Design a protein around this ligand. Structure first.
Ligand SMILES: CCCCCCCCCCC[C@@H](O)CC(=O)N[C@H]1[C@@H](OP(=O)(O)O)O[C@H](CO)[C@@H](O)[C@@H]1OC(=O)C[C@H](O)CCCCCCCCCCC
Ligand SMILES: *[C@@H]1O[C@H](CO)[C@@H](O[C@@H]2O[C@H](CO)[C@@H](O[C@@H]3O[C@H](CO)[C@@H](O)[C@H](O)[C@@H]3O)[C@H](O)[C@H]2NC(C)=O)[C@H](O)[C@H]1NC(C)=O
Ligand SMILES: *[C@@H]1O[C@H](CO)[C@@H](O[C@@H]2O[C@H](CO)[C@@H](O)[C@H](O)[C@H]2NC(C)=O)[C@H](O)[C@H]1NC(C)=O
Ligand SMILES: *[C@@H]1O[C@H](CO)[C@@H](O)[C@H](O)[C@H]1NC(C)=O
Ligand SMILES: [Fe+3]
Ligand SMILES: [Zn+2]
Ligand SMILES: [Zn+2]
Length: 341
């Protein structure tokens, strides 16, 4: 009865999920959809139990009644006493990244430039940067700010998708799943690396994890951190080592969400699954590692140490934080208290 149906977004996550299922002895099975929004709908219908989501999607899911269950917790340095599962999350740093060689480009000269976003509706790749831009320009025409962009999830024929590349066949251009070459943290950063875009809206960790040999992938294996710069809100440019004083915002960690009535069961199963396939899991790396997918961040971000319990049994609003929730609310007024489905 404690069989948990995970929802994989796209064929690559589906593949990983199938392996997880096999190894879990069917304690976890898989449902697959083409987009995160579609997965959310599968959960709402009760045809899937849960999935890990970025804060922007948590907002969508929460408005529809879904709740936070456990949050991704990466490596920390503070509070090192507590066990990962009980350690409070620290959130991640949303940043705007450019090539150092692209001299003179600052936060204040982004207009008409080319941009790379993780996907529409995501925290670092969309909600934070576009919310800030809309705000500063006093215009809801965020589709006319950048000359061209790759913002997975937007209209494929629009300029917001002009830079997306689709899959190895050139198909699925701009789809919001790993099939799109420039999808997600890694895809958006690659979009910048290959100079397809002038700026990439990702998180701090993405830059470090795909530079100086941290990634063996063909497009990243030869990337050096010193060739990149972060754009601070005061118009200055800083080395990627100064993210703490040069970010667009602190984002709430991605987290697992499920229907309220399945929360308890999903939590129980996951806590047990990571004991087996997590960071120091009994069967990882020997049999299967839930938090690995060769930098592709499938199902979970690859830098996840463990899924941690949430203190205070927070509502989706409490988990995201009132400020972030309000920021999203305001941005969405551009394109009010009900489920978008
Ligand atoms: C522009 C950027 C500026 C920089 C800002 C810096 C902050 C960014 C961090 C992300 C924000 C988010 O984490 C805030 C948050 O979560 N707040 C708690 C709070 O909600 P608010 O809406 O913010 O009032 O109030 C709620 C109650 O009043 C409380 O529940 C909320 O949520 C939490 O605190 C959730 C937990 O912290 C989840 C993490 C695990 C911590 C506990 C350890 C586990 C042990 C539990 C054992 C059962
Ligand atoms: C874009 O600009 C809008 C408009 O200012 C921002 O929304 C505003 O956000 C602030 C801060 O979150 C809200 O202020 C208040 O917060 C305090 C708690 O500190 C609370 O006590 C007050 O009641 C109030 O909510 C302000 O209300 C809110 N304005 C509106 C109309 O909701 C938004 O944050 C900006 N977006 C980004 C990404 O910065
Ligand atoms: C930005 O993210 C990077 C990558 O996650 C962080 O670098 C890691 O820092 C941790 C300690 O916090 C070390 O355990 C790792 O060795 C680092 N990884 C790499 C590849 O360098 C960095 O600390 C983060 N910076 C900020 C400001 O949060
Ligand atoms: C599957 O879940 C059952 C239920 O308790 C548990 O006994 C078993 O150890 C689990 N097996 C795996 C490999 O997940
Ligand atoms: Fe995110
Ligand atoms: Zn800050
Ligand atoms: Zn509460």
């Amino acid at each position: 009865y404690t069989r948990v149906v995970w929802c994989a977004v796209g064929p690559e996550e589906q593949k990983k999920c199938q392996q997880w299922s096999q190894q879990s002895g069917q304690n976890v099975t898989c449902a697959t959809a083409s987009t995160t929004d579609d997965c959310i709908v599968l959960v709402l219908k009760g045809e899937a139990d849960a999935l890990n989501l970025d804060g922007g999607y948590i907002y969508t899911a929460g408005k529809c009644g879904l709740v936070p269950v456990l949050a991704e917790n990466r490596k920390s340095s503070k509070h090192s006493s507590l066990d990962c599962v009980l350690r409070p999350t620290e959130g991640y740093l949303a940043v705007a990244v450019v090539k150092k060689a692209n001299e003179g480009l600052t936060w204040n000269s982004l207009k008409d430039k080319k941009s790379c976003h993780t996907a529409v509706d995501r925290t670092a790749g969309w909600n934070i940067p576009m919310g800030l831009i809309v705000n500063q320009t006093g215009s809801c025409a965020f589709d006319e700010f950048f000359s061209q962009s790759c913002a997975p999830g937007a209209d494929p024929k629009s300029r917001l998708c002009a830079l997306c590349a689709g899959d190895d066949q050139g198909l699925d251009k701009c789809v919001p799943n790993s099939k799109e070459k420039y999808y997600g943290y890694t895809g958006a950063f690659r979009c910048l690396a290959e100079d397809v875009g002038d700026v990439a809206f990702v998180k701090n960790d993405t830059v470090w994890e795909n530079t100086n040999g941290e990634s063996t992938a063909d497009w990243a294996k030869n990337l050096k951190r010193e060739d990149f710069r972060l754009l601070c809100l005061d118009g200055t440019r800083k080395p990627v080592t100064e993210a703490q004083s040069c970010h667009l915002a602190v984002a709430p960690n991605h987290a697992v969400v499920s229907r309220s009535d399945r929360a308890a069961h999903v939590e129980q199963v996951l806590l047990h699954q990571q004991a087996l396939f997590g960071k120091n899991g009994k069967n990882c790396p020997d049999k299967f590692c839930l938090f690995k997918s060769e930098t592709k961040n499938l199902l979970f971000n690859d830098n996840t140490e463990c899924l941690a319990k949430l203190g205070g049994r927070p509502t989706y609003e409490e988990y995201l934080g009132t400020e972030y929730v309000t920021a999203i609310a305001n941005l969405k007024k551009c394109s009010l208290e009900a489920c978008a489905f």
